[PDB]
Amino acid sequence: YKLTYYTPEYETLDTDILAAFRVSPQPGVPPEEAGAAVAAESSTGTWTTVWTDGLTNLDRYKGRCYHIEPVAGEENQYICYVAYPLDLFEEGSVTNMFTSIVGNVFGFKALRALRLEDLRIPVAYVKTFQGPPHGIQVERDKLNKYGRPLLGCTIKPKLGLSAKNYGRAVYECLRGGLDFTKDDENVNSQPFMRWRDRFLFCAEALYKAQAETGEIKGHYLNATAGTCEDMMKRAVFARELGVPIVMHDYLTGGFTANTTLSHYCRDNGLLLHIHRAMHAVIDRQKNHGMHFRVLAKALRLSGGDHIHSGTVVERDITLGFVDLLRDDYTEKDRSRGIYFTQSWVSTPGVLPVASGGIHVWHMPALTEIFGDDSVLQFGGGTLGHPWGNAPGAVANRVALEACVQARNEGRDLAREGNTIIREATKWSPELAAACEVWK
Amino acid sequence: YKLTYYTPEYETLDTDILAAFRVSPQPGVPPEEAGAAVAAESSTGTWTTVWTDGLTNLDRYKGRCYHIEPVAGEENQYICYVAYPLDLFEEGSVTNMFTSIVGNVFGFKALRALRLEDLRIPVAYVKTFQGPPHGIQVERDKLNKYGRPLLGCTIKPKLGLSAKNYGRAVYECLRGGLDFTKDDENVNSQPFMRWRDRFLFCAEALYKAQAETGEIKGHYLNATAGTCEDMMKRAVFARELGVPIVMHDYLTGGFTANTTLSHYCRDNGLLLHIHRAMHAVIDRQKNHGMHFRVLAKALRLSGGDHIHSGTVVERDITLGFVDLLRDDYTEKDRSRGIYFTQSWVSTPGVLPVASGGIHVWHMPALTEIFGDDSVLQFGGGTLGHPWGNAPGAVANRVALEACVQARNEGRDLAREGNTIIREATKWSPELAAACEVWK
Amino acid sequence: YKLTYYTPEYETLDTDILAAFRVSPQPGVPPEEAGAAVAAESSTGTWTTVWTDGLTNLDRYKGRCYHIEPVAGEENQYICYVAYPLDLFEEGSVTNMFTSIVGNVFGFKALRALRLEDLRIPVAYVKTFQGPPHGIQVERDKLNKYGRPLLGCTIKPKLGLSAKNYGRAVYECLRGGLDFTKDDENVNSQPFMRWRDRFLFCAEALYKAQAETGEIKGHYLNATAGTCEDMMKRAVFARELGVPIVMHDYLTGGFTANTTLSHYCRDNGLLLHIHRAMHAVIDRQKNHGMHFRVLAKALRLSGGDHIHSGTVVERDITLGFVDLLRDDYTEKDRSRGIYFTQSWVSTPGVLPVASGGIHVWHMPALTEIFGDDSVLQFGGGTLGHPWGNAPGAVANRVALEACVQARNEGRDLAREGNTIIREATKWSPELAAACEVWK
Amino acid sequence: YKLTYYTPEYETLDTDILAAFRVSPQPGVPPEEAGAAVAAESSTGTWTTVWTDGLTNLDRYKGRCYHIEPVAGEENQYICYVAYPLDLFEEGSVTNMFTSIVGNVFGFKALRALRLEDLRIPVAYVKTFQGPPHGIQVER
Amino acid sequence: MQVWPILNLKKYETLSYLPPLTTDQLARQVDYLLNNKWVPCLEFETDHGFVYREHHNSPGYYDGRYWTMWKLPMFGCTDPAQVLNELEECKKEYPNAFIRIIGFDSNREVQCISFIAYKPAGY
Amino acid sequence: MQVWPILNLKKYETLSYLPPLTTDQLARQVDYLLNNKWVPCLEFETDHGFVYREHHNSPGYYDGRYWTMWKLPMFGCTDPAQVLNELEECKKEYPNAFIRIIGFDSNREVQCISFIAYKPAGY
Ligand SMILES: [Mg+2]
Ligand SMILES: [Mg+2]
Ligand SMILES: [Mg+2]
């Protein structure tokens, strides 16, 4: 391998798919051989010589470890850069992109562990995908919502409520000022709440709240299912109801099904909310797996309008992949975990969704860290308010707007956040009530 | 949590989905709290109290850590057993089963790492799935192949050959005595070989080989694609050609798409070969992820006739999940990594596929370890033979049959394997030729 | 050829397709031979004798140059009249009509240049086509608009605006008094504005303007696409929105696709606006190509309700083909470039669309030259008004109505046009404002 | 136009669709203005100012005549090179590619004649098309 | 810079953007029809005189296009005073109606004219 | 425990849940737009100023999103007093209208701001 696959003189082409792998070799395996193994094992590379190789020109199809750099503060760990020719991939198939790059290497004996950190998707390959059904700017225009983060509320308990009671909670949340309500990732179709009954009661609740407030509302209707057919039946009924948004667990449903749903959403005007259930099984450990930024790029290609992206409140790593989801161009920046400069050639950005144990006191921090283009999801942060859902929703909407006003006036959210919240409690009994339960 | 979720007095129900998690808590977190966290975090469990919980009976929907046992020889690591009520799951949806159990917990702060080791799927839930389109016995009857492992040959190079040259290699392999040829997991549809041209040339080659030898042949036509639609178009053309088997990368394509394909295969009589590309991203590290036996049970439910399962030549761990894929009933056996007794209530077994760097000298070991019900896949082990593919195929078929005859005569493959091979080289110039290149 | 194809004694049949070609022979080629070459080369005529010709009666299938006349003031240029038998053409196929007549001759070596000036389409062939989906009178009845030219406004910039901003411009234009807004010919589906988002926002804007003014409004939604399928998907969504009119670039999309769209428009009640992008590539030079009147007849057969036809403000040539698009019968008139008398046997007329750098001061001239049955398209003439689109629209609508009133009262638009406009500025601040920016 | 559309300093991007036009201007029209006319007329370029232009960044959507060279042995004829941004085109639509580039310019008054000689189709745009159903090697 | 009003600015097609026509301008428009050999006819609407969609929504379908005929087309009418006299008559019976003059070209066999001749109370 | 009202509680998106903005707060919001190089523009609506669905029902389609432009976007505006002066002007001509301030980011080429600046009679 060493000879054929380690090519430090290599100049990558603008059409090459580049990969940065965090390699931990078995003791006794030098870096250059490991990098050469990673490149061979994820491309051509056969344990024995075969006569058919002479039928083609294998140099044109091989992966090439073109660069290796030690990892600081780690023992026996390197970042190996591999380049894959454009011709190895099926146009528009995230499924094939992952199979080719990540389908075989991770089990290599010579490696003790392996983690894909980033991928440079070439613009020629980016153009073969649809990308987000709508994207940030189109979504804001459709919903007629500008200059502030969007607000959502996850309905709990996830299991146990009947479809109607679930819808009642949806109405009380939306009427209070939140933009969206949401189905938990686990909520598909189960004995106590079949999908159709849920869709229907959620439709009545959201239209009631929209008519009451005058503001456009939505509920992420979970379309994740066991088969493509079942998934399509759920999305089709959403279209029938005339509602704005559906949801999909892209990792558990998978890339083939997600792409299908993404295309259907584009063709029918449905916004698509993506939940990343199961991601931690893959991206958690620093030594083995795939970093979330790689899964985030994949989703932007397959397609989704929102994508769950954590909560921060490693800030920098997170902000790094937030730029990768939202912007058209992001320059290489190791301090932010960005290994390659990435261009999107006008593929729409995806709205990052912050979630998890957040409440009113995190509002100045979330607004400051994510800015306007984000969706802030509050489950217990709304359903746990002492006066109920509507007041819980009002407290969140008021705290958010107080932060946006203050920021716009030039106040520093980092330093004055708590004060901006305290100031609003003097005129918002709902917020005052929430603040008492939380900080 | 401790109070609500750690229930050591709990008697599991025969309808409960049971999970065995390998838990590594953060220092300062006692086992009982961690187990209680794992159960809460993967079921109900909210960071703050919500009024809607009083609308139902949450005890009926909660996960329950009912047992905890220390891991031997590990520091701060336990196996926590969690029970999930039947009512939490959508019938026939592996996608929902994984989302519910594995969609959220792995990211819990209090846990340093987490690995799902096994799941006891209750018979009531098993009956909601189709399972394998055909299964072991039906596949043997259809192919009219009995009393020996099946033999396959993976075509290489994976990329680079034109569709016709690829088909030429397929014919030379099959005519030599192998039962199947195979598309690499990366081979879907690419610039130098579009799927339809491949399907067509592979069809001509396999029918030519079948007419020459008189034995039924097949080629695993890869139907993995970017969308459900594209995947279905490929399977439909296979049906049109009248061929016996298609292939799918179930992890990269995903569970929703796999189930769709599995149902279509059942309805059209197609055998389904499953490749586990990307599995090592998830199942490799002992401390975090999902063990392969869990992914193997999932595949048996969603559906597949063959499933890649490694190569052995931890023997025992492997044999443990081989029984889980093939048998109707497997008793709890910690020495083999079997945490729960598992019943399948007549769901057909799946044929394990051994692959990876194997050649003639491993034949006695593979036959002995896997027995008759297995598929032995030889890439370089055939395409690397000095006289070409047909002789490479004959050498493998002869070595296998020599081993089966010897075993049937009562010889010990473990102790006499090399001798049984040496004895056959005296009358098989093809095998003699292979043996010279290998041991 | 001379012998077989130059037939000056020939009496054309009423079923013959007659063609007038402007022929510029190579020096040394007499007119009669060139005319004979043009007729042979566009019909039978083979460089060598073939035995199969004796299987039929080729006299019945040959093109016949029956007349030749010198072109005045030109050196070595003639008008050759060729007659083609009815039997050469596929019923209802403009595609075949053009292939047969214009598919081969233009490259003939003996010719230095060649231009098709006109075609006499026989009534028997005219009856095989659908013609306009609706036509002039039906369109006026549907829109309930009588006694004046229709007014449109092309939205600019063509690229750059988001779908919503584009729709905002559409509403401001329509509410001011214009009947239609329009998608530029380049506007199909691009990264910053996908077709569906545009269709949807344009629908909201046009319904808002219609509800405000009480007058029926429309927006030419561009359905031109890369494939028949994509084009049909766009037209189908227009039908779904219940809007009145779609648009097609008939030359770049092509005749086969245009005819398909025309038939769909007839069956679904959609008006069809035709843009002639790329026409100048073909019709510009006097010596080679096809004159626009030929492309105009083709469109009337394939089908379209509006057709872009220039701006005049060679008047006479233009008025000549305007009659060919609108009337049921037009007599031969060389002074107007009409080489053949043309009957349409009740095929509906097409509304000519004047466009290009026009503003309020051209209003009396446009009304006088085109009369009531025309559509006057104003891009910068509206979007360039100093007070914005609505006032720009009002200024145009007022100037037009002032001209219609004046004309109806018997005033001479040719001599009093500027005065009629000046008189209206005394009571229309919007028009007064436009007049200041323009003349 | 001259100012906005003739950009001799321009470095074309690998994603740009490049066009080589054989331009024959009307007498009295210098090459740089004609090239600038060809680029404007086949992209943005409006006879009068419109307020909506301020809603976007038109520099990102304009065609740019980046180079002009005289034609040898011809009187008053030049090859003008125009660059069109990738964003102007619909993926996989030859119909739209031709409409955008060739749909309007050929009729420009200031031009006596115009011929499109060649186009550099960028690889990013090439990947949006299927291309030949089979092609040479597969057919053989 | 003046903003085009939004309220109560409904229009009625041809000639409705010009100041209301005087009796004399009305008389000249009607003479145009006669001189062209088009037949004058009056239409009136008491309910809403603008287009709307109540009964169907497919392309080209609108409610409110047809108004109701005042008597019959005035075939063989030679004097505009005849038409204006009916306008007066219609206005007296329907002071609350929108009344427009329409004309038919029996040669092209289509309605070819339509202009608002009277609008009620502050319209 | 207080119950969130049900009647007459229509909202207008961003900043509509805060107490009405004073002239000074208005001036600071407008300075934010200028400091970001966004173009201010005013929109007003005399009829209903909330979203509804009259003409179509498919996903993402709503009526009532577009209001009507007060003059033109204020390109090259450097002083908030210019904007507030138009607000005053608009309010005088349309005391019955809902008036909001919107802004355009010609760089991202999208509308990026929208907040209620004036609401009529007890709204
Ligand atoms: Mg959740
Ligand atoms: Mg493989
Ligand atoms: Mg145009």
Q: Where are the domains of chain A?
A: 3-129, 130-438
Q: Which chains touch A (3 or more CB pairs under 8 A)?
A: B, C, D, F
Residues of C with CB under 8 A from a CB of A: 162-164, 191-192, 194, 196-197, 200-201, 233
Residues of E with CB under 8 A from a CB of C: 1-4, 6, 9-19, 25, 28-29, 32, 49-51, 53, 57-62, 65, 102, 108, 110-115
- Structural domains present in chain E: 1-123 (3.30.190.10)
Closest CA to E13 of C151, B227, C121, B222: C151
Q: What count of Cα atoms within 13 Å lies in the side-chain half-sphere of residue A168?
A: 9
- Put simply, whether C410 touches E (Cβ < 8 Å) is yes
Q: Do A346 and D87 touch (CB under 8 A)?
A: yes
Other C-beta atoms closer than 10 Å to the C-beta of B405 total 13
Distance CA B38, CA D20 (A): 66
The CA B184 to ligand 2 mean position distance, Å, reads: 4
The CA B226 to ligand 1 mean position distance, Å, reads: 27
Reply yes or no on whether B109 is catalytic. no
Which residue is catalytic, options C127, C145, C156, C164? C156
Closest CA to C94 of C352, C281, C347, C303: C303
Q: Do A227 and B260 touch (CB under 8 A)?
A: yes
Which residues fall within 8 angstroms of residue E120, CB to CB, at 6 or more apart? E95, E96, E97, E98
Q: Which residues of F touch D55 (CB under 8 A)?
A: 73, 104, 106, 109
For helices C363-370 and C413-425, angle between their N-to-C axes, nearest 10 degrees? 140
Is beta strand A180-182 parallel, antiparallel or unpaired with respect to A218-222?
parallel
Q: Do F108 and A243 touch (CB under 8 A)?
A: no
Other C-beta atoms closer than 10 Å to the C-beta of C334 total 9
- Put simply, whether C191 touches F (Cβ < 8 Å) is no
Q: What count of Cα atoms within 13 Å lies in the side-chain half-sphere of residue A163?
A: 18
Cα separation values, C413 from C173, C178, C314, C359, Å:
26, 22, 19, 16
- Residue A222, beta-bridge partner list: A247
Question: Chain A: nearest CA to D81, how far in angstroms?
Answer: 23
Question: Chain D: nearest CA to B239, how far in angstroms?
Answer: 22
What are the structure tokens assigned to C348, written together? 């509906």
Q: What is the CATH number of domain C130-438?
A: 3.20.20.110
| Whether A382 contacts A373, CB under 8 Å | no
**DSSP at A205:** H
Per the entry, the structure determination technique was X-ray
**For chain F, how many residues are written?**
123
- Put simply, whether A215 touches F (Cβ < 8 Å) is yes
| Whether A346 contacts A328, CB under 8 Å | yes
* Ligand closest to CA B103: 1
Which residue is catalytic, options A275, A297, A306, A362? A275
Q: Where are the alpha helices (DSSP H) in C189-332?
A: 195-213, 228-241, 250-253, 255-268, 279-283, 292-302, 315-326
Q: Quote the radius of gyration of chain F (alpha carbons, Å).
A: 15
Distance CA B193, CA C380 (A): 51
Q: Is the dihedral of CA A104, A106, A112, A115 positive or negative?
A: positive
Binding-site positions of C:
46, 104, 154, 158, 182, 184-185, 275-276, 308, 355, 357, 379-380
Give the nearest chain A residue to F9 (CA atoms). A213
The CA B169 to ligand 2 mean position distance, Å, reads: 16
Q: Which residues of F touch A398 (CB under 8 A)?
A: 17-18
Residue A157: asked if its preceding bond is cis (omega within 30°), the reply is yes
- Residue C69, beta-bridge partner list: C79
| Whether C272 contacts C261, CB under 8 Å | yes
Does D104 carry a binding-site annotation?
Answer: yes
Report residue F59 CA to chain centroid gap: 24
* The residue type at A268: N
Distance CA B352, CA B309 (A): 6
Report residue E81 CA to chain centroid gap: 17
**H or E, element range at B293:** helix B292-302
Contacts 24+ apart (CB under 8 A), F77-81: F77/F34, F77/F39, F77/F40, F78/F34, F80/F26, F80/F27, F80/F30, F80/F31, F80/F34, F81/F27
Find where tokens 């080429």 sit. F109
**For chain A, how many residues are written?**
439
Residues of A with CB under 8 A from a CB of D: 14-15, 91, 123-128, 345-346
The CA-based angle B264-B267-B272, given to 5 degrees, is: 55
**Inter-chain Cβ pairs, chain C and chain E, closer than 8 A:** 107
Distance CA C427, CA C407 (A): 19
**For chain C, how many residues are written?**
439
* Ligand closest to CA C153: 3
Cα separation values, C42 from C7, C10, C52, C105, Å:
15, 18, 19, 5
- Phi and psi at residue C391, to the nearest 5°: -65, -35
- Residue A354, beta-bridge partner list: A376
Q: Quote the radius of gyration of chain D (alpha carbons, Å).
A: 16
* The residue type at C331: E
Question: Chain D: nearest CA to C300, how far in angstroms?
Answer: 21
Does D46 carry a binding-site annotation?
Answer: yes
- Residue C79, beta-bridge partner list: C22, C69
- Closest in A147, A176, A244 to F115, CB measured: A147
Q: Which chains touch C (3 or more CB pairs under 8 A)?
A: A, D, E, F
Q: Which residues of E touch C177 (CB under 8 A)?
A: 11, 17
Give the nearest chain C residue to A144 (CA atoms). C164
| Whether A310 contacts A354, CB under 8 Å | yes
| Whether A373 contacts A136, CB under 8 Å | yes
> Resolution of the experimental model in angstroms, please?
2.2
**H or E, element range at A308:** strand A306-308
Q: Do A346 and C201 touch (CB under 8 A)?
A: no
Closest CA to A80 of A11, A18, A122: A18
Q: Do B162 and D134 touch (CB under 8 A)?
A: no
* Ligand closest to CA A153: 1
Do chains E and C touch by CB distance (3+ pairs < 8 Å)? yes
Q: What SS3 string covers chain E?
A: CCCCCCCCCCCCCCCCCCCCCCHHHHHHHHHHHHHHCCEEEEEEECCCCCCECCCCCCCCCCECCCCEEECCCCCCCCCHHHHHHHHHHHHHHCCCCEEEEEEEECCCCEEEEEEEEECCCCC
B64 φ/ψ sector (left φ>0, alpha ψ -120 to 50, else beta): beta
Q: Do D123 and A124 touch (CB under 8 A)?
A: yes
Assigned CATH topology for domain A3-129: Alpha-Beta Plaits (3.30.70)
Reply yes or no on whether B275 is catalytic. yes
Cα separation values, C337 from C65, C293, C315, C322, Å:
20, 9, 11, 11
Find where tokens 């002995």 sit. B368
Distance CA A16, CA A35 (A): 17
* Ligand closest to CA A356: 1
**H or E, element range at B295:** helix B292-302
Residue A30: asked if its preceding bond is cis (omega within 30°), the reply is no
The CA B127 to ligand 1 mean position distance, Å, reads: 28
| Whether B318 contacts B310, CB under 8 Å | yes
Q: Which chains touch D (3 or more CB pairs under 8 A)?
A: A, B, C, F
Is beta strand C271-275 parallel, antiparallel or unpaired with respect to C245-249?
parallel
Distance CA B14, CA B124 (A): 8
Does B308 carry a binding-site annotation?
Answer: yes
